[PDB]
Design a protein around this ligand. Sequence first.
Ligand SMILES: [Zn+2]
Ligand SMILES: [Zn+2]
Lengths: 66, 107, 343, 46, 51
Amino acid sequence: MIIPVRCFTCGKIVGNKWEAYLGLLQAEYTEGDALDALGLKRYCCRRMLLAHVDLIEKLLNYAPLE
Amino acid sequence: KTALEMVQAAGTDRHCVTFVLHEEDHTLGNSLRYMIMKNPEVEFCGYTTTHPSESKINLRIQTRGTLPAVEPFQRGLNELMNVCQHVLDKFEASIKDYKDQKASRNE
Amino acid sequence: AASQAVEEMRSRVVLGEFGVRNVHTTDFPGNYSGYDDAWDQDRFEKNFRVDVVHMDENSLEFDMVGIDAAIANAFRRILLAEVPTMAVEKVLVYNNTSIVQDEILAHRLGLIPIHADPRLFEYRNQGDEEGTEIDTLQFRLQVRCTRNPHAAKDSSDPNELYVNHKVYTRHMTWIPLGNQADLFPEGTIRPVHDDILIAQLRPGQEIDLLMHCVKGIGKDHAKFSPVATASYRLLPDITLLEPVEGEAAEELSRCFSPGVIEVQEVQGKKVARVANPRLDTFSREIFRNEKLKKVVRLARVRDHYIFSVESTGVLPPDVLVSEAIKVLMGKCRRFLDELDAVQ
Amino acid sequence: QPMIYICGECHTENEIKSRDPIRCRECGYRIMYKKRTKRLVVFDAR
Amino acid sequence: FTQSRWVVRKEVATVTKLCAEDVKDFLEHMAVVRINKGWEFILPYDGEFIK
Ligand SMILES: [Zn+2]
Ligand SMILES: [Zn+2]
C-alpha cells in the first residue's frame, strides 16, 4: 500500500526516499542512476524501491471525501 | 534468582563439572571458551545451547591433573575482562588522535 | 619444506578455486611441536593496535590487528543486538479516520528512530503502564486534512487542492513530562530524520494520537537496534609468484577491481604490481583465465579485521562501539560477582 | 442525543432513532454507516 | 514544439499545472525520449515548400 519505513533485510531507513526517487525519475534519469544518486548500495536495499507498487494513490480515489 | 549452576560429573572429584549459565548465548559462550582453551591445564572445553526455545549454555571443563575446574573458569573470566579493558583504552585513544588530526588538518 | 607450509597453514586463509582452506584457528598450547601458545598478556598487549581509516557522521571504518574472531564476532553481535536505544512502544489513539489501519499505523510508528540519549533513562519496571519522568518519553501527533481555500481552477495537482494531505514525521511534537523541560534543552528530543512519510490523507480525514517511548534492546525487537549494519572482513593479501609482463599484465589488472593492480613502465615494457590490495571484493575471476591460474595466490590475513559500522543516527558510531566493548566487561563482571557470592 | 448515521453517498449526518425506513435526508441513497467510537484504544507498536 | 526543435522542459506541469502523468501522456503522442536531453519531436523536418 505505502512505502515501508525500513529495509527488511538490513534495517536501513528507506522510507524517506520515495518522493526523491520519483523526482529523479521525472528528470529523465534511469533507475540505476537514480538509485545510485540516493546512495542505496547493497542490492538488498535497491529492491526496496525498485519493486514497490504505490497502491495508496489509487485506493484514495475510492475513499469518501467532501 | 541465581543465574549460575554447577553440576558435577557422575562420580568425579570436581575436575569434571558442567557450568550452566542462564540468559546467555554464543556471545559470551564462544569468547569464554576461547579464553579457557588457552590455559595449558585444560584437557577438554566446549559449550552447547540446550534448546533454541531456552536461554542457557552448558560450558564443560575437564582439567588434566586434580585441580578443580572452577579455577580455570575464574582465570578465563579475569583474562577476558582485562582484554576488553585494554581494547577499550586503545580504541578510545586512537579515535581521539584521529579526531584531533582532523581538527588540525586542512585549516 | 615443513616450516613454511606450517606457517602458511597457521597464519593465512587460502581461497582456492572450489573451496576456502585453513578456516579454523589453531593457536592453542600443544597443537604445534615447535612453538608455544600459552596465553601471554605482554605478548598480546605488544602486538594489538587499532587504525581509524575513515570517519564522518553516521559512518565509521577502522581496523583491529591482533584480535581473534572469537572476540571480534562478540563485539559485532553486541553491536547488533545488545546496545540499548529508545523506541515507541505504546500508542494511544482516539479518532483515527485515515485509510491506514490502526495496527499497521502503530507498527509503522514503532520503527521511527528517536534522538534521545538512552544513557539517561532506566528500564521501565513490569506493569506500571503510566510510567514517569525517569523512564519514558512522550510525543503527540495531530493533523487534519482540509481543502485549500485559495486553490486555482486547475483542480488537478494534489499539492494545491489540499493542505496537509501528507503526514510526515515532522508533525510530532514533544510533550515534556515532569522536569524534563529543564534538563534537555530545546531541540534535543526529536525524531532523527524529519522526512519519513507516515501516512497519506484526503480532505475530511484526521489522525490524532499520543505515543509513549521506552528503553529496550535489539535482541527483543529489531526496532531497538542502533546500527544499520555492522560487519567485518579479513584484510586481503594477493601475491603473484612470477613476474607478469606485456599484455598479460593488462589481463591481470583486468581480472581484479580497478584499484588493486597497477601497471607501470620500467624500461619500455609493462610490469604488473599489486599496489593496493585493500579494495578487492574477491570476484575470483582469475580462475576463468587458464594461463594466469598458476601465477597468483589468493589469501586473507587471519588476525587483521576491517570493521565497518554505520549508525542509524541515535548516537555517533564511536560511542556505539565503546558501549559495545563495555557490555562484555559487564557480563564477565556479573559472572565473577556471582561466583564469589556462591563460593 | 439521537444517534447519527453517516450516509453512504453524500456523507451528511442523519438521525433516525425510530423504525423509520432507512433513506438519506438529502439524497436518495439507502445505505448508512455508524460513526467511529469515542473511547480510546491502546495498541502495542510491535 | 513549433518554437523549438525539441522541448527540454520536464516540468511543463509547472507552467500548465496538470499532474505529471498528463504531461507524459501529452508528450507521448508527438514526442520521444532522449536520455538526459528531454523530449524530441517524433519525426523529422520536411521540404514543406515543395507543395
Ligand atoms: Zn538493506
Ligand atoms: Zn445522502
